[PDB]
Write a protein that binds this ligand. Sequence first.
Ligand code: NI
Ligand SMILES: [Zn+2]
Ligand SMILES: [Zn+2]
Ligand SMILES: [Zn+2]
Length: 269
Amino acid sequence: KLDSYTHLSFYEKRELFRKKLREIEGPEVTLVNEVDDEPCPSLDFQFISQYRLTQGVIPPDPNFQSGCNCSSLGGCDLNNPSRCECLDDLDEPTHFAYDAQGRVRADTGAVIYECNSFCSCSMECPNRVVQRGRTLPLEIFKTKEKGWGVRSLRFAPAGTFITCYLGEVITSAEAAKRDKNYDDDGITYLFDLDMFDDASEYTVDAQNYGDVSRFFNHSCSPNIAIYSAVRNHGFRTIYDLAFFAIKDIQPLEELTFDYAGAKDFSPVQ
Ligand code: NI
Ligand SMILES: [Zn+2]
Ligand SMILES: [Zn+2]
Ligand SMILES: [Zn+2]
């Protein structure tokens, strides 16, 4: 029932969005809508691959960073939990967060300690998973009752890294400033970085800048979860919000999460 002008307008809008997706560095990200005629999600945002820092936010200074030098040939060898200085932040059931497959071991907690730029291993170092980024091709799609969601295009074994939640790092102050501007917003892309001290009170906002993950929906029985990955072991005022599959993800299955912090990880209770 759309007239020629509208039909063409929707067509061009959906193509601009797919162009925006083709420009993302990494596996393919597609756009589909089998539910209605909505061209695509709003185009008023920019995809980024790094946190965008704002006014007032004092980022963790990289200068005071510890760099493990236990890089023999390959990475850092996952059999030497007692050799890395990236792991010195805790010694109990010692071990690297990942196995050989690059998946996140089930004995790994809510905190992952990856190697820094101050370490001596190559980018293929098994403890540089998150840093290597997305490997799974994804698809943004129109759900029937919820807005747009994201589903995997390939099967993803439990423990597989998916992507990080990127955005603008704002202070909990301005966060509230924006909270006073959120009008009839069906979704408020806010993510608090309070895994540790609550003094920093920093929050990630993906409203104008973000990654594909800004499209992920919430759910009660999620298949992905946030893993606080850190490189600057000394200053966790800002760290990476990493999504890892918690269970096997079938191809075309929608990806959903529900942040619970370290209050769903370490406890069987
Ligand atoms: Ni089409
Ligand atoms: Zn190491
Ligand atoms: Zn290291
Ligand atoms: Zn390393």
